[PDB]
């Protein structure tokens, strides 16, 4: 249907809005501590700690795929890079420390692209 058409072409412009957010978000990650996942191989028991791990690399897989429909989806998963490492890392570690600079940076960031998103439709 052509309704279906135009319910694509939203979800395509979405993904490409959230292409920019992410890089922007990235970008205040300069040491690449939230690039890739954690590995199962150097902390063997991160997932009895953790369950639900993200990272960087596998949110612009989902993305790609456009798999969020939706801004708060896509939040949803930059909150668990950054409230995953404030558990596993304690305060005094750089991690710890990494994911706040990176919540308090993106902030900004994501509070404008919840304009845009509201904004354009």
Not at 26 to 35: L, N, S, T, V
Not at 56 to 73: D, S
Not at 91 to 119: H, I, K
Request: charged share 35%; with cysteine; net charge negative.
């Amino acid at each position: 249907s052509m309704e279906q058409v135009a319910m694509e072409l939203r979800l395509t412009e979405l993904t490409r809005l959230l292409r920019s957010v992410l890089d922007q978000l990235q970008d205040k990650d300069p040491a690449r501590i939230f690039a890739q996942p954690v590995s199962l191989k150097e902390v063997p028991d991160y997932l009895d700690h953790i369950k639900h791990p993200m990272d960087f690399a596998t949110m612009r897989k989902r993305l790609e795929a456009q798999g969020y429909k939706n801004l708060h989806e896509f939040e949803e998963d930059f909150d668990l890079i950054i409230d995953n490492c404030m558990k596993y890392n304690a305060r005094d570690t750089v991690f710890y420390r990494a994911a706040v600079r990176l919540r308090d940076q993106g902030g900004v960031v994501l509070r404008q692209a919840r304009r845009e998103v509201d904004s354009i439709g």
